[PDB]
Hints:
Number of strands of chain E: 6
Number of strands of chain A: 28
CATH superfamily of chain A: YVTN repeat-like/Quinoprotein amine dehydrogenase
Shape of chain E: elongated
Largest sheet of chain A: 4 strands, antiparallel
Radius of gyration of chain E: 22 Å
Largest interface: A-C, 60 and 40 residues
Structural class of chain E: alpha/beta
Number of helices of chain A: 2
Strand content of chain E: 15-25%
Largest sheet of chain E: 6 strands, mixed
Number of helices of chain E: 6
CATH architecture of chain A: 7 Propeller
Order of helices and strands of chain A: HHEEEEEEEEEEEEEEEEEEEEEEEEEEEE
Strand order of the largest sheet of chain A: 1-28-27-26
PDB class: membrane protein
Chain A: Guanine nucleotide-binding protein G(I)/G(S)/G(T) subunit beta-1
Structural class of chain A: mainly beta
Entry title: Cryo-EM structure of the CCL15(26-92) bound CCR1-Gi complex
Keywords: GPCR, membrne protein
Shape of chain A: globular
Order of helices and strands of chain E: HEHEEEHEHHEH
Assembly: hexameric
CATH class of chain A: Mainly Beta
CATH topology of chain A: Methylamine Dehydrogenase, Chain H
Bound molecules: cholesterol
Helix content of chain A: under 10%
Distance between the termini of chain A: 63 Å
Strand content of chain A: over 45%
Oligomer: heterohexamer
Amino acid sequence: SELDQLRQEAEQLKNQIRDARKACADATLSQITNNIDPVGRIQMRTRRTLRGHLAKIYAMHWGTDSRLLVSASQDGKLIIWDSYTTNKVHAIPLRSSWVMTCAYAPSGNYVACGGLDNICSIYNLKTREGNVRVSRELAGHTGYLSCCRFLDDNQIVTSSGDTTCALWDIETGQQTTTFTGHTGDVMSLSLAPDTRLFVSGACDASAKLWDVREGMCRQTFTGHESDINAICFFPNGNAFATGSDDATCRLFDLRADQELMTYSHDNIICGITSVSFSKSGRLLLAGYDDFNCNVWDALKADRAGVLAGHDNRVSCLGVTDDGMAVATGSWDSFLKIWN
Amino acid sequence: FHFAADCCTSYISQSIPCSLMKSYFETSSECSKPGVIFLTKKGRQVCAKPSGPGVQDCMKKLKPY
Amino acid sequence: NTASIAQARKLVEQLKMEANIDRIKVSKAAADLMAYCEAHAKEDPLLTPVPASENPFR
Amino acid sequence: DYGDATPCQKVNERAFGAQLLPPLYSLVFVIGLVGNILVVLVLVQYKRLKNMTSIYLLNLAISDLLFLFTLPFWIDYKLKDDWVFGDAMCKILSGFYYTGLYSEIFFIILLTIDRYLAIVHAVFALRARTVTFGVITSIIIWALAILASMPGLYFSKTQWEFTHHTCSLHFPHESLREWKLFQALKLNLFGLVLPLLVMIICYTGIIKILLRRPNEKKSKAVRLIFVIMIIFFLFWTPYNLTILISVFQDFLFTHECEQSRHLDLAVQVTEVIAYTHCCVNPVIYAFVGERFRKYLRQLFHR
Amino acid sequence: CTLSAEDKAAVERSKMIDRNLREDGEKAAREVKLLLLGAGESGKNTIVKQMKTGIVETHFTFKDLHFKMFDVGAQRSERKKWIHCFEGVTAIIFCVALSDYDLMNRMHASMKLFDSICNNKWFTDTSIILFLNKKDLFEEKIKKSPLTICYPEYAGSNTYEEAAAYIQCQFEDLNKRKDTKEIYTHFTCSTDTKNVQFVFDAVTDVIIKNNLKDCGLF
Amino acid sequence: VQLVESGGGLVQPGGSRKLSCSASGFAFSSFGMHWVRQAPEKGLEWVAYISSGSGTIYYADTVKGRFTISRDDPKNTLFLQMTSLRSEDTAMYYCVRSIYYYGSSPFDFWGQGTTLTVSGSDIVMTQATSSVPVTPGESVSISCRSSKSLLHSNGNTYLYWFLQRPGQSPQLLIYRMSNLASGVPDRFSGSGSGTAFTLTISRLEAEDVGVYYCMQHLEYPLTFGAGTKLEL
Ligand SMILES: CC(C)CCC[C@@H](C)[C@H]1CC[C@H]2[C@@H]3CC=C4C[C@@H](O)CC[C@]4(C)[C@H]3CC[C@]12C
């Protein structure tokens, strides 16, 4: 029986990986940050409130200039917002209203949008006609689009509920590499600061680290008991935090290859919808279905603060590239900016 | 709120000598019939019509004082 | 099943290459992450808030 | 000599009115304010789910408060039996009282028509129950309520009656009876006949629909509708009958200001109930509903 | 106001965007949204053809009401991750084939799907319009194959009315929230004209109940 | 993108004429539209402005009351009604598109213009030079000055630079001081401090010869510079 032998070899290989990881875990992060002063209490106030979406907000993404936002709602519209003045720069009618993700290109020229139509639409912001046009539709996924991130004006990574990720060349509209290996629906992506690597968490309770050019998985990270809904690299790109439906955040280190910290509380029993870091990486921000956001001390695992102020599930978060403000979106139809 | 103001039901038949009368009043609309109150030195009030002979010229004479 | 044989072969191919990884100790990774957070502490506006004059959202 | 005619001196009626009316109004006013303030608070709080029904209920609460404003002045008046206020104060209070009554009745009519349109014409009501139409009709109703209050504005006066001061309406002579009838006919054809006619015509159709495919929540609503109709009828009908009797009191009553004293007493007692309808009003249209209870509970929690 | 000329033109453009987003939302608010659902190889396509790759949307108009139907078939992914997107749908049309009892047992799969949908936390107060399709083929088969093979405890004769009523009751007993949501059941065939009218009546009842909740009677 | 002007010709003093601007190839409703005149030998002068959606309208003080601006958005045309025409109204009229939002580039497309021949608190901007003899390949520095600082609390300095080539309509070069316009070579650059403004040209070409205009967009009326001409 080749299959039985093959299953065995998988088992001893998994045991070897577990042993090599236990060998690496000489000390915990909680034992080294025990001499580090706590951040104290962090109070943040709403500074702006963004009104105009007439349905649940599913995704938002800051621009790299730290003023403009793209926000996606089930009302079938993207809104590009000026965060300083609250003015709406653009309103983009979507061909399909069942959007789940939105991306803003780092150059600022394009926005990506996708969802239950299994398509990633690229909208050109800067046209001679003075309107926003659909520049391309990327088809080829057989499950819904759950996340998308630009690497450049011509390359985008998407993740799908068909268990796979894809890297697309935008000019030709073709997949240049497909990333397979998750056995459940892939929920979220995060790109490394240098965009050579990216992590994806899926509904198999697993996060995989992928090399973009080679197109193959480098590492697999386990430990969550339920679906992973959110994932995010640490600022330097040597760690990432994941958030799941089991009411837990977990910080993983790429070079150590283990789980490094757990962020949970007995008073929290709801799923985690979104996670984000601060510029220094000292704060981990998470949005919950309890209708608020928690600010964790990412090195001491303490709860440092709370962002309350939403009437529904905090569906999405975003920390701005220059670090001044936090944005929260929600199923209550409103975006809020916090300082 | 229907104060139920004092009202008139009968009228003096003679023309008023109001040298006996210190003051006057025109009744509240809660009355069925309009009327005029006259207050005396002896102090007992009486009623007369708005259209009475002496009432008009005397209330012109006996203005608030 | 030949399809399962193939699926299985792939899983092993992946487990081998994931096994041959030069892992570092958890203590050094923790120290590096803590050192990064110490280095960029003053540049994080959400951790050390800035005066309202230079806050763009005042 | 001039000792023939004397005024009737309804002193005992002043005393017994002083006994009842100030204490009764002391509760009508406070519970009415509580109900209506909690109503306007729960509304103007969501600022999202605000449709024609919310506009009409808000204006009904405003009408209720506008009426309630005038009471403390009249407990003051009835306690002292002395108007300590100015002539312009009487003008303003008379206007407030009349516009409060008329606007309350008209906004109950608008709420009933709103329900009829939402329930019997639910498909059409999608393109008709808009906030802009709610505001336009609300302003038209407010204008009509102001227009109906004009006689109370123009004719109200003050006069010093013999060691005390009175506030009254003092309609012009030779047209007193004529004027009084008109003032009674407004309240009896725009405050009794029209609201009952509208309520019966709309609620027969609403009940007809809710009786098809019965359910527990349907029979509860039907009983609620019957409660609303009965409350409004029994609260408002005696007031209109008392006003009609008072208009023609000279013909009806053989022995004048012996039974007319009791007529005035009955009028005051009936006005007590007609004003208490202003307090039963916010419970009937706001509290019994599920969404308003939910929003009040959320306001409690925060 | 301490705004540039260009700032004021930017604010004016933002307010124009406000107006149109309000017009779009008002237009959306008059729309009846239907979630079309059911097992594969059922009369779902028959229903769609009578009314008129990810989500498929169908738009039709009937008696001044505009209807949007969202076929989420061809989405082979975990339902729990996108079903909450349809929280706020006016009704769920659910297609079940009556001919599927004698084909695990396929009708039992339809019951499992119905049970998972009806008692979902996102559709607590969402009504269900249940279509039992292919009654003509069910008429034919009920002779050769009894309903006992699908239902061990069935104790009735091989007649259309009794077996069909048994199936309907079996489906309606899966509702664990009978006091919050209605189930409207229709017995339709391949060649029918009244399906649109039945959906219209059920949606009118749902609208009337929502209006009762708004007006304050409920 | 095309803006084609029509009308014009010879008109008697005190008369009336209607100018039309037909827009094609862009989202006309989304764009504010200006009218700018150029006298037969003078520089540019802003005449009228109508915003997107007709909400706001501005006129110059020299034409207020005699000139009217309207837009028929469905038929894609802008109209100017002129009454009581004077001798000072003899000019070539340019229809200019403009769009305003964070990061946009106003005054970016100019029409071809039509010729019409007739038989105190304003910000004044001076280009203290009228001609600059130059040769290809060298650097050039043109200057403008403002009566008041064009810097705003926004951080935006509202200084536009335009180039008019011989027998052509103006072209936007630098829109908000130091921002290069679309399709403009990098040879051009802009700098300034509040009231003193410099346009720098590197590796000069034969195409770059023309008249350069500084404009302000702090408030209305919009004021152009006198213009500096480049020779050879
Ligand atoms: C008796 C005098 C002094 C007061 C008359 C009341 C009128 C003039 C005032 C008082 C109540 C007011 C209304 C109160 C609330 C609403 C609902 C809102 O969505 C539209 C405006 C509207 C309709 C207001 C308009 C102004 C209004 C109609």
